[PDB]
Design a protein around this ligand. Structure first.
Ligand SMILES: [Cl-]
Ligand SMILES: [Mg+2]
Ligand SMILES: [Mg+2]
Ligand SMILES: [Mg+2]
Ligand SMILES: [Mg+2]
Lengths: 250, 243, 196, 244, 231, 195, 226, 241, 204
């Protein structure tokens, strides 16, 4: 009834490769395509809701998750690993930031904390790395809008636009041709839907696509009135109807 | 291959080979049985007389838990003792908190979860015993049998060890021939017979019979050993049936 | 506080006043001191309101987990869990709890757990500051195997007197009836019980 | 039990080498090259970003050059995530020293502390070492301008000019050829960029691929200024030195 | 073969090889005999020397005034187990003013040995013990194996060539059990039993070790010229 | 321990510390040196609870000597005083605090300046031209306020110190058995053997 | 401090005065004693002000995480249970006395909680040094089936009784209304009946009145380039 | 090849121990089914008592976790009971801490997170079970949430688990393709149980007696299991139309 | 015996039009004994100013603590901390020593670099925030300062008028306190310049 794995399960091979990290990246490659695009007045993150059965209710499975009111996350790879990372990311935003500074962390620092948790699963005793790559989109007052990718190694990079998982190589080429520094949010959503159609085989609609934005403040979603400085969350998950509306102008 | 070298490793079948190897140690042990009767339970066990130098009636194998539960087992005897020691701790803490003595199904799960926990890690070995146990609680008589995997079910009759097939067949006859049920005193006699019949699998060495029972009418719902005239009556009945 | 539990032919009835005081100020005049730890096991609370609430919540947790595993607990079992908490934490608790419940096998049972954490199974029990004034009345008027209406009258009259003499007690007389039929709440207002 | 699966990260080979340290160094040899050059009036840190994509947001990106305090900076070669764990420890150590003594931490003391942490992972704990090599560029009032390097073994050494990561053999020869002791910061900037331009595995050296920094005692009124170069400023210094 | 690297691993036939290898250490050890009547219980032990300059390794250890054992196998493991028995005998006396039953002493040794066979990192005990005692139900003799199995007997022997002594006791059973109120004759039977396990060497004055416990006899060990009487 | 004085002049720091050690009824010693050399150009005098004073001083001495060997370098008086303050500030919220008051007189070889630091048992640090602990300041500060100049020589500092000690010997009820005087300057630490 | 809670038809209202005091001295004349735990769960706080802010923010933080974990809007009974178990553990040393009110999918709720961990249920509650003055008003004018407008009126009248009659309370009335199926409306300084009158004199000094020894520029900027 | 013995990645990015735990799932050779009514959630499971010496009342793979939540398990009984005891403890702790009954979907998530840990941490093996949680949730209504050894979970309109799960799944898929609703449009739970049993008979192609089935029913504020005589009444009604 | 009045001293902060002011006396004592006339009680971390009264060892300890924390903040955030954020950091830090507190009365003052808004705040020894529009007072003559500020203060004073108001508030409060005085300092803070002025006052 002992934990006897106090030694690293990820180690350097003779060629300098960290095998378990590479194999985690291979698991991410098999995962469903997800992408992120940054506009001047917002960020969009999107993915396919690959339903494991038609009897399953794919609304109950959230691939796109709110981390803070101004930060959202999407993934490619192993879903269960993502779910526990979201739980830890939400909690670390409070314990190592909000309970100290009385405000939510900026995107880059929350990303840094997630990256740290993933790095530790790459060096600590008796654990394998997380088999996910995350795309974290967010806004904060001093940095503005931003989009970050986080890999199983714990490495993170800021992107203007990117894609991860199944059809990422093709999707990144598509985003290079379309992306410019003068995009509005609606233009980025349009490009996101165009890019994502290429990697989807079957049905392509609001029920099979999950899409969220980091944009303007939503005082209608705040839940209370009376404090002028609190203007509401910038994270908003688009509805099934809102996606289908934009697919007609596609 | 290599899946059978470490406990808690799933083979490509979905099996835990180390648990299946513990079963082999159980199959190698002496025969033990349990019979559920009208208002209680009867336990019996085969004790192989390795030598004349063994003191008769002294090396007692059946163990009591609390005052109302009997436990008998086949396989590695020390593993069985370790399991009963745990059972006694579980029964003590239950009674400490809840006042009432531990119910038999509750007690069965306490042993079950503990045995199951020894299939979860490579740092421990599975239990090398199948345990037949039971007694009388507020809801009546209960007989259980618990395997190395942590699996257990309730039984009408139970048997384990080297002579288990022989015993099981004899128990199945009693179930068919007595649907209304069996009395406590009948079950003691039948238990003696079944151990004697099951001794054909261990026929090289002679043996010593040991019986215990809990019965609401015969023992006030307490576990007691069958001794003296009642034990000899059961031996005589058993000896008459084999001839 | 004036609280009592009384066994009768069909089961058991718990009774209580509704007053909670901080010094001479009545912090709550409509307090509910009859609290449920299981469907048919309730208790009357006296002493530190923080302590008796904390204890009762833990007991309700223990009996819920008991029920998931072993089916419905006895009233004796519930009293034992209360006792374990009260006895082992006697140095840091001020709690005087009466446990009352209905089995079909055992029928109505009452257990009182005073400050020390001892247990005492009784036909009826009285407790709280106002109970001192009705030891005489309750001993003279209690009978075993009373009807429901007689037992309600016995509790009503008893707590009426406890309320009359004890400043710490007052407000409404709440009662909870535990029988095979189910769980019935009763309430009795000042204009009713004062004129008795 | 568990013994079966243990790689045993902290053992000697028959030749007296630490397997995991040697393999971590092999990992580091594939990382983008980082160069440090120390002059009389300052220190230059130049480093090559590894991944080139047009879509990478360069102005907000940091994989190579990190600030430890106002006087000390590091250039990283190896696993970026491993480096950030160590960097945060060094940042805390610097502030602990400042709290205790009310003076900025001397460069060597910080370097020794980090190097000791790396050493620990090679001698006990059964964990893999950190796959990181640092170049430390710093200033204090005792020794003035200092360059150091540390590697996964926990060994550190002092340098006038040094490279880590890819093509260090080639890079160290080129530096050894053109370095002189009386050299100045503006000359050292030019040497660092010329060296990277020759050793790079890429077809050409451009601004979007580089991180660049200078520590100068050429702040207003005898103070020391760290300057992490912006993308546009790296583009300007590439045109000035005549590489693009 | 593949399943003997540690105690935590069952073989495909349900065997624990590390326990069986510990059992083998006992067979290599020097012979010791145990036997009892209704009044007394006796240990007789053939001690082993390293060479002619060396002392003879002590085989018998006292656990209490009414109990003690003889060892065969790893002597440091007997020291660990006898120290544990001393403490349990002592705990019984101090807390309950009660002499520890010999049967209960066997149960404690069984359970201590068992824990070492089921967990990783540990090893089984590499020693076999013969415990004699006189308690409230008379004389007792136990045989402890480091598998955990403890067995109450009239007589037995463990160690190298122990089968010869064990056969003799099996024949003599009806005679030596009746040797009541005569400690010298019971020891004689034990000395005659251990003689069946000798080859080449014979029982000398610093070779032989005898212990006895009984009705009005505390556990006492006899070595040196004290055992010359029985040679 | 009773009286410890400090005065920073032009080119040195002078520490004067009483020689008496009293244990209740009797004066057990009249030649006690209430000081430790922390480094070649840093001296610390101390006064407070019995046992704690010396234990603390020697603990500080060991740590500064350890630092000196590790870095092959003498810490500045400011750095030493900050280290000492933190240890006392750590001490005050402990299970059993060090009841020790100190003066740290040092010559900063980098800045070529004498420096005097006053730190009480709570960890209250102040840099001063002259300082004291306990009741010593009550008698002496009026004289120091009057006569002190920042450009005084070492000999003038000693004469002003004699006046302070004379006032202490006149008006204090306790016999502190005179003072040991030590000077800290660019050449190190030396004791004035006749005072 | 005077704080109240009043149930009504389709929700609950809480209110508070705005005076924070150290002994007999008024530290803040416009203090906010109404705290958000979640968007639709607010509480009014009395007792040690650091303790009330700390316990609200801790439970509020854990409530938010719980809401995200369960994909459900937070319940008042959860805020109550977490507050009481925390306060009980600290045996009254965390001096927080709170009136906890809110709306959730279960309905509208009103509780009080004391520093030792006892909780209470009611249609109208008061806490703080002005609680007796407030409760007098509540006991005189409360009825069943109050409208929103009647509950706001009653609540602010109860706070006024505290403001005027209790020395520990003063200045303004803050109100928060939590109605079922609507956003909670926080009404900061709902009443302002204690504006200071214009002073008789201006105390603005002539420039150069104060004697100065030294002037210097303080460098707030970082170390500069070049 | 020790990447197949513990839960670390193979070169393909696979966890073989997780995959083999899924195979242990079908070791009992028992098929389960869960469907939703208007006011209820029904779960049915095959019951096989091969030995005549067994007490058939003690043979069960349906568990009463809390009053509101029921759980059926597909997998060996020791791992089933391990999961059952834990789910009971987690449901009780939740009620104590947060003051309301643990929702079905939240329990499923919690047990899924625990299962995820066994796929990441080496010393703990996965449990070889699929857990199907059922309730009538006070916010979401009739609910089916299923957990597996990978740590995956999701909500279901209806679901099936076991060796012959695909046959049952396609049968259910086809019914909901006709009706075009997310549930069985039926008022009484009795008729929803009759639907569940009927559609299992059609999918598996086998007839059932009262002792061959085991039924669990979730209603508002209680989950309960049907007796052999309650099932017999269900089987009589099916045969009579 | 009372830790908050062993050493003595005061801090006052005020807001004006596009500016804030913070000011403190210079005394450190051991009860009746005056020890230092140069013990400054105002510190700054970038453009955020922190005054601290109370026990002097804790004043020094907290300054060293917030320097530590704001340095690490700046390295990670890549920007200087703002007054609003720092105020929450001070509160968090004090409350984490709830049952063994620092015996201090901190006062935050500064201008938000992005919004340009003047900001002041005060705290009790365990971290309760008083965010006043007008003024914040702290120390052994806090009552005296409350009296001065309440009558002398008017809103939207220009920087050079605000200097006179805060100076006269501090000086006359300190002269009615035995444990305060021995010199004084006044910081006038604008968005991108800060002037520091030492005041001449009675030295008793
Ligand atoms: Cl979880
Ligand atoms: Mg009254
Ligand atoms: Mg695992
Ligand atoms: Mg004064
Ligand atoms: Mg004066």
């Amino acid at each position: 009834m002992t934990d006897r794995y106090s030694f690293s399960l990820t180690t350097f091979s003779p060629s300098g490769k960290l095998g378990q990290i590479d194999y985690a990246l291979t698991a991410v490659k098999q995962g469903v395509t997800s992408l992120g695009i940054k506009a001047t007045n917002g960020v969009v993150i999107a993915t396919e809701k690959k339903s494991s059965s038609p009897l399953a209710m794919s609304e109950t499975l959230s691939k796109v998750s709110l981390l803070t009111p101004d930060i959202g996350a999407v993934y490619s790879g192993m879903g269960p690993d993502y779910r526990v990372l979201v739980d830890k990311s939400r909690k670390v935003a409070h314990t190592s930031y909000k309970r100290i500074y009385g405000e939510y962390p900026p995107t880059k620092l929350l990303v840094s904390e997630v990256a740290k948790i993933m790095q530790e699963a790459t060096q600590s005793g008796g654990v394998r790395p997380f088999g996910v790559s995350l795309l974290i989109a967010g806004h904060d007052e001093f940095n503005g809008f931003s989009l970050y990718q986080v890999d199983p190694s714990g490495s993170y990079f800021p992107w203007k636009a990117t894609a991860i998982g199944k059809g990422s190589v093709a999707a990144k080429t598509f985003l290079e041709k379309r992306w410019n520094d003068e995009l509005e949010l609606e233009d980025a959503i349009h490009i996101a839907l165009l890019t994502l159609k290429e990697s989807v085989e079957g049905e392509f609609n609001g029920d099979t696509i999950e899409l969220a934005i980091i944009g303007d403040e939503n005082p209608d979603l705040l839940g209370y009135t009376g404090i002028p400085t609190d203007k509401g969350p910038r994270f908003r998950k688009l509805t099934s109807q809102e996606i289908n509306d934009r697919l007609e102008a596609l | 291959t290599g899946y059978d070298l470490s406990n808690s490793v799933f083979s490509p079948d979905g099996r835990n080979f180390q648990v299946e190897y513990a079963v082999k140690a159980v199959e190698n042990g002496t025969t033990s049985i349990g019979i559920k009767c009208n208002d209680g339970v009867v336990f019996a066990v085969e004790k192989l007389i390795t030598s004349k130098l063994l003191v008769p009636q002294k090396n007692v194998k059946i163990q009591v838990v609390d005052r109302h539960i009997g436990c008998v087992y086949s396989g590695l005897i020390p593993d069985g003792r370790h399991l009963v020691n745990r059972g006694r701790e579980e029964a003590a803490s239950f009674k400490k908190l809840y006042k009432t003595p531990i119910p038999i199904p509750a007690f069965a799960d306490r042993l079950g979860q503990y045995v199951q926990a020894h299939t979860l890690y490579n740092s421990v070995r599975p239990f090398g015993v199948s345990t037949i146990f039971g007694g009388v609680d507020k809801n009546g008589a209960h007989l259980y049998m618990l395997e190395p995997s942590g699996s257990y079910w309730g039984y009408k009759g139970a048997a384990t060890g080297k002579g288990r097939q022989s015993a099981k067949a004899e128990l199945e006859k009693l179930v068919d021939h007595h649907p209304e049920g069996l009395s406590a005193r009948e079950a003691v006699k039948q238990a003696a017979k079944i151990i004697y019949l099951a001794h054909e699998d261990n026929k090289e060495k002679d043996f010593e019979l040991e019986i215990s029972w809990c019965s609401l009418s015969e023992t006030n719902g307490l576990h007691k050993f069958v001794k003296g005239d009642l034990l000899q009556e059961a031996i005589d009945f058993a000896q008459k049936e084999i001839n | 506080t004036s609280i009592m539990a009384v066994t009768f032919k069909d089961g058991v009835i718990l009774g209580a006043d509704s007053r909670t005081t901080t010094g001479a100020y009545i912090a709550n005049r409509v307090t509910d001191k009859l609290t449920r730890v299981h469907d048919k096991i309730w208790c009357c609370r006296s002493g530190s309101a923080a302590d008796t609430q904390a204890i009762a919540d833990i007991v309700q947790y223990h009996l819920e987990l008991y029920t998931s595993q072993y089916g419905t607990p006895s009233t004796e079992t519930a009293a034992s869990v209360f006792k374990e908490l009260c006895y082992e934490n006697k140095d840091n608790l001020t709690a005087g709890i009466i446990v009352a419940g209905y089995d079909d096998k055992n029928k109505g049972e009452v257990y009182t757990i005073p400050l020390g954490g001892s247990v005492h199974k009784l036909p009826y029990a009285i407790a709280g500051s106002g109970s001192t004034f009705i030891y005489g009345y309750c001993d003279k008027n209690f009978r075993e195997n009373m009807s429901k209406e007689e037992t309600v009258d016995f509790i009503k009259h008893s707590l009426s007197q406890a309320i009359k003499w004890d400043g710490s007690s007052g407000g409404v007389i709440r009662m909870v009836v535990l029988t095979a039929a189910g769980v019935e709440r009763l309430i009795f207002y000042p204009d009713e019980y004062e004129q008795l | 039990g568990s013994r079966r699966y243990d790689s045993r990260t902290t053992i000697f080979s028959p030749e007296g080498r630490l397997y995991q340290v040697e393999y971590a160094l092999e990992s580091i040899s594939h990382a983008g090259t980082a160069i440090g050059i120390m002059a009389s009036d300052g220190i230059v840190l130049a480093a090559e970003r590894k991944v080139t994509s047009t879509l990478l947001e360069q102005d907000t990106s940091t994989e190579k050059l990190y600030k430890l305090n106002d006087k000390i900076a590091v250039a990283v070669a190896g696993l970026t995530a491993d480096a950030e764990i160590l960097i945060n420890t060094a940042r805390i150590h610097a502030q602990n020293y400042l709290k205790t003594y009310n003076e900025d931490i001397p460069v060597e003391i910080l370097v020794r502390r980090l190097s000791d942490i790396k050493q620990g992972y090679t001698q006990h704990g059964g964990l893999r070492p950190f796959g990181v090599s640092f170049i430390y560029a710093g200033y204090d009032d005792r020794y003035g301008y200092q360059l150091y390097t540390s590697n996964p073994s926990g060994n550190y050494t002092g340098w006038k000019a040094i490279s880590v990561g890819a093509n260090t053999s080639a890079a160290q020869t080129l530096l050894q050829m053109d370095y002189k002791d009386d050299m100045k910061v503006d000359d050292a900037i030019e040497l660092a960029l010329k060296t990277l331009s020759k050793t790079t595995d890429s077809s050409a050296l451009t601004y979007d691929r580089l991180e660049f920094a200078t520590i100068r005692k050429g702040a207003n009124d005898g103070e020391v200024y760290q300057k992490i170069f912006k993308p546009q400023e790296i583009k300007d210094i590439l045109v000035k030195t005549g590489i693009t | 073969n593949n399943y003997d690297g540690d105690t935590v691993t069952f073989s495909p036939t349900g065997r624990l090889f590390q326990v069986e290898y510990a059992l083998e250490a006992i067979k290599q050890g020097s012979v010791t005999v145990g036997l009892r009547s209704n009044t007394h219980a006796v240990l007789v032990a053939l001690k082993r020397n390293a060479d002619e300059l060396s002392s003879y390794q002590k085989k018998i250890i006292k656990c209490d005034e009414h109990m003690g054992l003889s060892l065969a196998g790893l002597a440091p493991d007997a020291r660990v187990l006898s120290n544990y028995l001393r403490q349990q005998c002592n705990y019984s006396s101090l807390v309950f003013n009660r002499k520890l039953a010999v049967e209960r002493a066997g149960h404690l040794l069984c359970d201590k040995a068992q824990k070492n066979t089921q967990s990783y990192g540990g090893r089984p005990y590499g020693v076999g013990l013969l415990i004699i005692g006189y308690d409230k139900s008379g004389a007792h003799l136990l045989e402890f194996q480091p598998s955990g199995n403890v067995t109450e007997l009239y007589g037995t022997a463990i160690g190298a060539r122990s089968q010869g002594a064990k056969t003799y006791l099996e024949r003599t059973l009806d005679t030596f059990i009746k040797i009541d109120g005569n400690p010298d004759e019971l020891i004689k039977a034990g000395v005659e039993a251990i003689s069946q396990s000798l080859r080449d060497e014979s029982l000398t004055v610093d070779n032989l070790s005898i212990a006895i416990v009984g009705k009005d006899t505390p556990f006492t060990i006899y070595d040196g010229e004290a055992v010359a009487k029985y040679i | 321990m009773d009286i410890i004085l400090g005065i920073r002049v032009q080119d040195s720091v002078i520490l004067a510390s009483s020689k008496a050690v009293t244990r209740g009824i009797s004066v057990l010693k009249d030649s006690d040196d209430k000081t430790r050399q922390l480094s070649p150009h840093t001296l610390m005098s101390f006064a407070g609870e019995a046992g704690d004073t010396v234990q603390f001083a020697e603990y500080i001495q060991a740590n500064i000597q350890l630092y000196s060997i590790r870095e092959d370098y003498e810490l500045s008086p400011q750095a030493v005083s900050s280290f000492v303050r933190q240890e006392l500030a750590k001490s005050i919220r402990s299970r059993r605090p060090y009841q020790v008051n100190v003066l740290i007189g040092g010559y900063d070889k980098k800045k070529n300046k004498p420096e005097l630091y006053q730190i009480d048992y709570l960890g209250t640090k102040v840099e001063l031209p002259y300082g004291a602990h306990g009741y010593s300041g009550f008698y002496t500060f009026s004289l120091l306020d009057h006569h002190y100049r920042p450009d005084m020589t070492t000999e003038e500092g000693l004469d002003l110190l004699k006046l302070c000690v004379q006032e202490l010997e006149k008006r204090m009820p306790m016999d502190f058995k005179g003072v040991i005087v030590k000077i800290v300057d660019k050449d190190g630490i030396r004791q004035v053997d006749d005072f | 401090t005077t704080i109240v809670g009043v149930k009504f038809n389709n929700g609950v209202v809480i209110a508070a005065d705005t005076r924070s005091t150290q002994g007999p001295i008024v530290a803040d004349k416009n203090c906010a004693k109404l705290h958000r735990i979640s968007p639709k769960i607010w509480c009014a706080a009395a007792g040690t002000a650091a303790d009330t802010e700390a316990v609200t923010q801790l439970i509020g933080s854990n409530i938010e995480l719980h809401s995200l974990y369960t994909s459900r809007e937070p319940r008042v009974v959860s805020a109550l249970q977490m507050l009481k178990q925390h306060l009980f553990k600290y045996q009254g040393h965390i001096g927080a006395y709170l009136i906890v009110a809110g709306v959730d999918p279960t309905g509208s709720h009103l509780f009080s909680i004391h520093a030792h961990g006892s909780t209470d249920v009611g249609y109208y509650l008061s806490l703080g040094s002005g609680s007796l003055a407030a409760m007098a008003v509540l006991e005189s004018h409360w009825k069943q089936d109050l409208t929103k407008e009647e509950a706001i009126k009653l609540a602010s009248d109860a706070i006024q009784a505290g403001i005027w009659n209790d020395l520990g309370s003063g200045s303004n009335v803050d109100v928060c209304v939590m109605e079922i199926g609507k956003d909670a409306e926080y009404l900061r300084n709902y009443l302002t009946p204690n504006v200071r009158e214009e002073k008789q004199k201006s105390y603005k000094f002539p420039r150069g009145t104060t004697a100065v020894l030294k002037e210097s520029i303080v460098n707030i900027c970082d170390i500069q380039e070049e | 090849g020790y990447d197949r013995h513990i839960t670390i990645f193979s070169p393909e990015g696979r966890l073989y121990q997780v995959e083999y735990a899924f195979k242990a799932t079908n070791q009992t050779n028992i098929n389960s089914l869960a469907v939703r009514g208007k006011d209820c959630t029904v779960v049915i499971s095959q019951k096989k008592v091969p030995d005549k010496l067994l007490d058939p009342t003690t043979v069960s793979y349906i568990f009463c976790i809390s009053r509101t939540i029921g759980m059926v398990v597909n997998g060996p009984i020791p791992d089933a009971r391990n999961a059952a005891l834990r789910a009971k403890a987690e449901a009780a702790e939740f009620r104590y801490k947060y003051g309301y009954d643990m929702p079905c979907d939240v329990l499923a998530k919690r047990m899924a997170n625990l299962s995820q840990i066994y796929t990441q941490r080496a010393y703990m093996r996965p449990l070889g079970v699929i857990l199907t949680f059922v309730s009538v949730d006070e916010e979401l209504g009739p609910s089916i949430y299923k957990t597996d050894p990978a740590g995956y979970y999701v909500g279901y309109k209806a679901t099936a688990t076991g060796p012959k799960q695909q046959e049952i799944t396609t049968n259910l898929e086809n019914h909901f393709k006709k009706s075009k609703i997310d549930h069985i449009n039926e008022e009484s739970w009795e008729k929803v149980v009759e639907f569940a049993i009927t559609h299992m008979i059609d999918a598996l192609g086998t007839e059932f007696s009262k002792n061959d089935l085991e039924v669990g029913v979730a209603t508002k504020d209680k989950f309960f299991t049907l007796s052999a005589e309650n099932i017999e009444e269900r089987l009589v009604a099916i045969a009579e139309q | 015996s009372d830790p908050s009045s062993i050493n003595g001293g005061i801090v006052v902060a005020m807001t004006g039009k596009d500016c804030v002011a913070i000011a403190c006396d210079l005394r450190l004592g051991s009860q009746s004994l005056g020890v230092s006339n140069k013990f400054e009680k105002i510190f700054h971390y970038g453009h955020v100013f922190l005054g601290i009264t109370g026990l002097a060892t804790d004043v020094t300890t907290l300054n060293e603590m917030f320097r530590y924390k704001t340095n690490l903040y700046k390295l990670k955030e890549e920007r200087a901390i703002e007054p609003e954020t720092f105020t929450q950091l001070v509160s968090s830090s004090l409350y984490e020593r709830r049952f063994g507190p620092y015996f201090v009365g901190p006062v935050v003052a500064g201008i938000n670099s992005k919004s340009g808004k003047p900001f002041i705040a005060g705290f009790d020894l365990i971290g309760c925030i008083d965010e006043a529009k007008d003024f914040i007072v702290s120390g052994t003559a806090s009552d005296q300062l409350f009296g001065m500020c309440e009558s002398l203060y008017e809103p939207n004073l220009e920087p050079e008028d605000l200097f006179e108001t805060i100076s006269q508030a501090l000086l006359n409060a300190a002269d009615r306190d035995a444990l305060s005085g021995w010199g004084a300092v006044v910081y006038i803070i604008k968005k991108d310049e800060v002037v520091k002025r030492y005041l001449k006052m009675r030295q008793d």
